[PDB]
Design a protein around this ligand. Sequence first.
Ligand SMILES: *[C@@]1(=O)C(=O)[N]C2=[C][C]=C(F)[C]=C21
Ligand SMILES: *[C@@]1(=O)C(=O)[N]C2=[C][C]=C(F)[C]=C21
Ligand SMILES: [Cl-]
Ligand SMILES: [Cl-]
Lengths: 187, 187
Amino acid sequence: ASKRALVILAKGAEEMETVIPVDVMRRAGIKVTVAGLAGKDPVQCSRDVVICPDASLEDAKKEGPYDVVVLPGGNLGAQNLSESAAVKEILKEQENRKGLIAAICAGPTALLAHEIGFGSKVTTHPLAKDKMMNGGHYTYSENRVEKDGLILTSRGPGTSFEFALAIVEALNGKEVAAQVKAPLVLK
Amino acid sequence: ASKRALVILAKGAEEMETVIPVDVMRRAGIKVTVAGLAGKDPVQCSRDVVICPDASLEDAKKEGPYDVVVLPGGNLGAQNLSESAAVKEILKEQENRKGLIAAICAGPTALLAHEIGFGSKVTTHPLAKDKMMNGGHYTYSENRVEKDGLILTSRGPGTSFEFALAIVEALNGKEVAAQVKAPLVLK
Ligand SMILES: *[C@@]1(=O)C(=O)[N]C2=[C][C]=C(F)[C]=C21
Ligand SMILES: *[C@@]1(=O)C(=O)[N]C2=[C][C]=C(F)[C]=C21
Ligand SMILES: [Cl-]
Ligand SMILES: [Cl-]
């Protein structure tokens, strides 16, 4: 059976961090749902790219659970994710069922806000480190991608391919990730 | 005065190759217009990401000329660009005025279709090489980014940051490109 990914898309999301994982996971045969935090309407990303979500988060949640829940970064996107009671519920449920949670750039700060995965080794964008580390509830890493069990984090737009391929490897295995990677012309 | 970029967005465009240059150029202070080939309506990219263009191409052309015209790849996107008389007119005008033209992945095959920049050194996605080289009207390169004068080409999703940063360097200089690059966490 095909794996299923939920990508939570908030106003101010970093569009590169949103699109690269969506595209790469689709390349891997994953069924991806781009879910609008605010509802069904188009979303103005951080650099003004406008993306039309597949569904509202409200609707997508009804089709859960998912093999991965993906949180893009962007400071303002991550803040909106961190402030959301709906996101809290989704992540809590995912963690409780031992499902993968993947977050990039400022995205991992929503894990802090929602008390997810405390004790995990994590990375973030360098500028989000102090926020993520407030309280010392995680151990910090400078690895471009960090996978500690079912908490998978990464650093920025420039680590988005690596992040996406790590998700693919976690869900579909090393060989599928390598097959997906080759046509992309990555260094 | 701020530089201005026209990004031509067709059905079947590769969304990563569209979003990465838009975002990165905006980070560089470039005024970017995401112009819908087909009109003003949202565009279904190659991996089903839906992007809402800033304007129709018809409308954006009225606000020309631009310091760069950018052609994303995606096989089907590039085919739509190659078949467009409106694209032909834009590229011909750009070339005639010694304005930069930038194309990635299968995107450079639209330069062939529209007889642009013959004699230039170019690259493409490896799978688009034979198409681009039909007639021997260009010289082929395996460089991740190739800039031959005012024709700037690149290879794939995984070269999109390098492509975008080369555009930024061409328009705004080396120091701006380096400043834009650092926060991205590129390898
Ligand atoms: C990232 O997307 C984010 O969440 N925070 C941040 C800062 C700088 C940057 F270049 C990207 C990002
Ligand atoms: C690219 O975006 C395109 O235009 N052609 C092609 C083939 C394979 C790939 F992975 C990307 C692209
Ligand atoms: Cl941001
Ligand atoms: Cl394609």
